[PDB]
Design an enzyme around this catalytic site. Sequence first.
Site, PDB file in Angstrom:
ATOM      1  N   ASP A 100     -79.837   2.667 -25.034  1.00 25.41           N
ATOM      2  CA  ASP A 100     -78.708   3.005 -24.174  1.00 25.41           C
ATOM      3  C   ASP A 100     -77.531   3.524 -25.004  1.00 25.41           C
ATOM      4  O   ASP A 100     -77.511   3.372 -26.220  1.00 25.41           O
ATOM      5  CB  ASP A 100     -78.288   1.792 -23.336  1.00 25.41           C
ATOM      6  CG  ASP A 100     -77.754   0.657 -24.176  1.00 25.41           C
ATOM      7  OD1 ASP A 100     -77.146   0.943 -25.226  1.00 25.41           O
ATOM      8  OD2 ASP A 100     -77.938  -0.516 -23.782  1.00 25.41           O
ATOM      9  N   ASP A 105     -71.376   2.923 -10.923  1.00 22.30           N
ATOM     10  CA  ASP A 105     -71.421   2.011 -12.060  1.00 22.30           C
ATOM     11  C   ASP A 105     -71.725   2.757 -13.368  1.00 22.30           C
ATOM     12  O   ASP A 105     -72.518   2.294 -14.199  1.00 22.30           O
ATOM     13  CB  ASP A 105     -72.473   0.924 -11.815  1.00 22.30           C
ATOM     14  CG  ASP A 105     -72.293  -0.285 -12.727  1.00 22.30           C
ATOM     15  OD1 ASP A 105     -71.242  -0.390 -13.401  1.00 22.30           O
ATOM     16  OD2 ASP A 105     -73.211  -1.134 -12.769  1.00 22.30           O
TER      17      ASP A 105
END
Lengths: 299, 257
Positions: free
Chosen positions: A87, A128
């Site tokens: 990520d 988000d």
Amino acid sequence: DMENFQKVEKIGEGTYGVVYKARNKLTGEVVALKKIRLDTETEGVPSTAIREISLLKELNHPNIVKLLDVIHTENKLYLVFEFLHQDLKKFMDASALTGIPLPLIKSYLFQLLQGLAFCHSHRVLHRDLKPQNLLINTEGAIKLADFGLARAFGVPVRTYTHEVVTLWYRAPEILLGCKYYSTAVDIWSLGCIFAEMVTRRALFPGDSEIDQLFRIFRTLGTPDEVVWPGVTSMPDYKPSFPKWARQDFSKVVPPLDEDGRSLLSQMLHYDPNKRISAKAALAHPFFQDVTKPVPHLRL
Amino acid sequence: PDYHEDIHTYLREMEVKCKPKVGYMKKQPDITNSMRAILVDWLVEVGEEYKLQNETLHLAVNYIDRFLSSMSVLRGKLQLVGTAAMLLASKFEEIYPPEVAEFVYITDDTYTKKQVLRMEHLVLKVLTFDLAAPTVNQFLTQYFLHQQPANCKVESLAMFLGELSLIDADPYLKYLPSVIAGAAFHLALYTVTGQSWPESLIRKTGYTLESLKPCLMDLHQTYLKAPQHAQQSIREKYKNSKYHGVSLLNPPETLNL
Ligand SMILES: CNC(=O)c1nn(C)c2c1ccc1cnc(NC3CCN(S(C)(=O)=O)CC3)nc12
């Protein structure tokens, strides 16, 4: 069916459940396998799963993590995704010393706006967007992930009386408590992530809703009826707000040229109606020379 | 926004795919358009008790109609289907849905928590988790932006007509959401202000008063007869002051087509 996967290692944990890296025993395909446990007498299939699955299989795009399969047994619900290596949070952290190369930042912010433009054109808010929900592989690609909080907005989406977007990336309109979300709150988040890649540090690391609001005010100046028609009428706006002045943007993000600064100031625009759209961001001059560097990933 | 047109185009694409078999009821051995109407009218009540969004109601009917399109269901189980549909629509649409316990309560303990969750699983399977369907509601919301002066009685009246359309599979199952919304918006606008389907929406949708005429003829018929309909929950709901009591408005004696 679930027999045909080999679990290789846990790569995610959350309220939602667990995510394993797994190997399809028959095809060899490497997969990210999300496991959710079901309350079979008092909950059923959770709402975030309903929404993630049904929205995600409408969004086929190279910059949006791909949902490959759903397996729904008695007690377990499995989502099978394509596997990515890392990520963006862990990469930004690993790169705090050297910094992320400007060429690579441009690549990523270009890609992210492509995935985002695609969501919004299919009436999906992500809501988000934050560094650890964005995924990168070793070939230089970056994709939007974690659509647990995503909503279809063919009918307008009402704002959670108790907020949603993690605070650092949350947009002024939400903090000032407007009635609806718009696509603009996704852009805002993306501006913050942009700046943060450039400066190696979170743009607005607030401690509370009110402290967040103020860190923003101190960098962008305190909004008035000229810069944002209507601010002073919003529910959580007080006239007792200190007037700060707009910080000069070459100080806020030094490493950026005239184009990088222009784009960012349009993504951080106060009035959501005027905040640049993702379709339009892609037309910005900043991206005229864009390319696709590959990251050096320390796995 | 800036995507207003991109989304309309996509909704128009999607409504053609998320469409139920127009003739499924003839093929259904044990249930009936009247049973379905009784069911949908009940779902409206449930929506009023638990204060759910109109969109939730529309999505639930979409789910039920697609599901009945490929599965035989007996009388005694039709309500279990409708209950699981309402539950699914709530999870998808509401900011937070009622829990399962509360849907078992308003079926009157005819069904179990276990059964309803079982049916939820089966409806998801049959609909292959495709829940983001276009609704009359979504199209009415697009069309409302094209009011030069926005008028709240027109919006409520339009919502009222659209919702009446959910009750009777015949004729409305053969019209698309965008088209029903068209008829509903024109009829409301004509009833309240006398204005007609506006030019800007002709451009947006490509729908002309001429092409809406068939659906518009049905909707007017339904509107006129609504006081005589066996199912009354929608008329009752729309005399609330949150809807400006529009269902008490007199329908026009004639359109002018
Ligand atoms: C709600 N949550 C989710 O939906 C979710 N959480 N995770 C961790 C992933 C999700 C979706 C597909 C995924 C596809 N690939 C990967 N890879 C991992 C993430 C990055 N790292 S790491 C921790 O080393 O940065 C290991 C590999 N993670 C995925």
